Amino acid sequence: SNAMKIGIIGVGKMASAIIKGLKQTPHELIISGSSLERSKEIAEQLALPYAMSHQDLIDQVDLVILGIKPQLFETVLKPLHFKQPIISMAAGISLQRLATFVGQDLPLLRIMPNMNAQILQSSTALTGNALVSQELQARVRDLTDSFGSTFDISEKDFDTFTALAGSSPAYIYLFIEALAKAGVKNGIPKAKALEIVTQTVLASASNLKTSSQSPHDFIDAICSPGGTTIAGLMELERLGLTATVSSAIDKTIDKAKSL
């Protein structure tokens, strides 16, 4: 059948998020944690089969997905013997470096998902090494489409995409929290302030998405002469909002590079 068996090594927050989307596929799933005790425990919570070891996982599966953090790739992967294509979700680790940990004869793929996988709206980058066929990439693209959208991104752009899509949800939340806290400062209860700004963020992003106008086109439209919005906007300029965000993205990329 089109159905394959997929094993996941390391199941934390990001891997847990993509499981939900993977349950909506025909495929069979099996997991493997940091200890056997931990594996049973999360297999409990997710209602899925667990493996007795990572090698035990590897020996029965058609495709492996790696959910461990990048700092543990060498330690965890080198002692193992892989036998199928592997997908890494890890920031900062190239396909070339993965091949040294895992083997030069394996088709290897990289994805860069985000926590919006939780609602099947991840914005996920996908790329493969020279051993990945058209058909295999398409099969994996089916997997990524199950928990959001999929972007065909060159590997040389993966670190930048990690910042724009992978990490940015946190920056978006801090920004949202900032508007809401400012509502609190100024008289509006937190829950109410959050509801208003979250709905406004949603609507503003849809409006941009479906319009041919740029972000600056909208800003010109919204800033009435001598109005309240231009006052707030020049305060954003004075305090360096744009420089702040961009510097943050630079730091994110720098970290991805050093990993």
Ligand X SMILES: NC(=O)c1ccc[n+]([C@@H]2O[C@H](COP(=O)([O-])OP(=O)(O)OC[C@H]3O[C@@H](n4cnc5c(N)ncnc54)[C@H](OP(=O)(O)O)[C@@H]3O)[C@@H](O)[C@H]2O)c1
H or E, element range at 29: strand 28-32
Please, which residue, 207 or 246, has the CB nearer to ligand X? 207
**Binding of ligand X at residue 40 (CB under 6 A)?**
no
**Binding of ligand X at residue 123 (CB under 6 A)?**
no
Among 4, 115, 120, 184, binds ligand X (CB under 6 A): 115
* Residues from 12 through 51 that contact a copy of itself (CB under 8 A): 12-14
Q: Look at residue 219 and give the partner it binds from a copy of itself, Na ion, ligand X, none, a contact being a CB closer than 5 to 8 Å depending on partner kind.
A: a copy of itself
**Binding of ligand X at residue 10 (CB under 6 A)?**
yes
Please, which residue, 3 or 245, has the CB nearer to a copy of itself? 245
Q: Counting beta carbons within 10 angstroms of the beta carbon of residue 196, is it exposed (0 to 12), middle (13 to 18) or buried (19 or more)?
A: middle
Applying CB under 8 A, the span of 21-29, 31-39, 98-106, 227-235 interacting with a copy of itself comes to 227-235
Applying CB under 8 A, the span of 31-39, 42-50, 128-136, 229-237 interacting with a copy of itself comes to 229-237
Report the C-alpha gap between 86 and 75 in whole angstroms.
17
19 is in an annotated binding site: no
Q: How many residues bind a copy of itself (CB under 8 A)?
A: 115
Token pair recorded at residue 86: 């592997």
Tokens 């069979």 correspond to 28
Among 59, 192, 214, 227, binds ligand X (CB under 6 A): 227
| Greatest Cα pair distance in the chain | 69
Report the C-alpha gap between 73 and 89 in whole angstroms.
11
Asked if residues 118 and 20 have their Cβ atoms less than 8 Å apart, the reply is yes
13 is in an annotated binding site: yes
Interface residues toward ligand X, by CB under 6 A: 9-15, 33-34, 38, 67-70, 72, 76, 89-91, 113-115, 166, 222, 224, 227
Annotated binding site for NADP(+): 9-14, 34, 38, 54, 68, 91, 221, 224
Interface residues toward Na ion, by CB under 5 A: 92, 257, 259
